[PDB]
């Protein structure tokens, strides 16, 4: 008895967050408009999966709720409500399946067969297709008003188990099997093609979408397999039968409970992604040497302060790639002169070893550690006086480098200079060296 207050509390709350989440859904993607075409595409059948979400949540959810709160009390939504309640149900069951299955061909002939892609796709036949799904689904769901009756008050079918057995596994084949096998296939043989295609617009768009199938279908087949699998259970099949009772409430609350949470979940995890992406962009585009696609992601608002796995700040590979533009522009939104790295490399560090000056300049006037050291022990002026730039050493020194400064192998600049048979670098040292016994008296 206590259950059912908790299942209700619950119930309601998917309702009302399920409801409102769907519906935002719904009005957000149709006043969304973008530049690319199959970003709209894409989300043309996303709006077509939150409808069948919304559908089910205001048509079927309020019936079980009834049928969960009044356990073994008369049917009370009359013939028409019974018969109803599965042709809505079976009418979602296969508007999901052909959307998904749909979305998978476009997305599939976008990446695999491009310049057959560009010949067949528009936006305004997808819209007029999307229509035809919903038709289809309707069509297919007719059948499920005749299966479907009341009797003595039982929403029972009305129908021989025979003639039962076959619309439940027609249902079971092409409302879910049918699209996961077609869903997994295409996504799988474009994905590959994809990563391939990597090794503008419109690409970016792809790598979206990719995204955006494998999450649907992911959340496509966690909600309906426990559903269509005590469906089959039906057409085939103790103790543990009150145990396998468990199984069904739970497979009709994961319909549910899903088609609540997928609209706050979809938004959260697009966050995520969105700004993880401007991020991934922001360091490729600084690496590549595109100080143009730069410009545009720090107003997008980028952050200039990205790292990758080894800790390289998009300053550290405009440093080390030699692009003075991306390095002043980078300095002018706030970066990091002095950002560590995993080995605690400094821009400086890299701007030194590359061996361009302007940058060791504009590092040096943005306040760039001199004397910065790694892990390793090594310091800009070793890297300099390694791969032997006189002119970087000069401007090193000059903005109070530490000419003794020792490593972890117990060789200093000087040595390195030698080492490396850099003849006229070493010379500077040695100067320079000098000049600090006499200051140092
Ligand atoms: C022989 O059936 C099973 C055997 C083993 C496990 C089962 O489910 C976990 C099932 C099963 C499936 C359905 C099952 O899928 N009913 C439907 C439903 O979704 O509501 C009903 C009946 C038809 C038309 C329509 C849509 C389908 C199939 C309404 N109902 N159902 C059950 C039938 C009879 N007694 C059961 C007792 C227990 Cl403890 C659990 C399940 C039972």
Redesign the pocket.
Known sequence: IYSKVLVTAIYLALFVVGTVGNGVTLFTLARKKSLQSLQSRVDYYLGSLALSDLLILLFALPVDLYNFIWVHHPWAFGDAGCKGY?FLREACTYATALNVVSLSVELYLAICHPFKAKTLMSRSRTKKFISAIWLASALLAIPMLF??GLQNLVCT?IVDTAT?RVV?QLNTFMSFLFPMLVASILNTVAARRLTVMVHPGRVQALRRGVLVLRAVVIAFVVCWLPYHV??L??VY?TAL??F??Y??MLSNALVYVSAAINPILYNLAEDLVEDWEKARKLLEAARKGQDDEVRILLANGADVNTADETGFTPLHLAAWEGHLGIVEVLLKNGADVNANDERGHTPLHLAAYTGHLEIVEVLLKNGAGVNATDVIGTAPLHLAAMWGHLEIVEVLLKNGADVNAQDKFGKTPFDLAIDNGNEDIAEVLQKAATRELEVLF
């Open positions: 599965y299966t479907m079918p039962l439940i005590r469906r259970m039906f099949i039968f009150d396998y009772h199984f069904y």
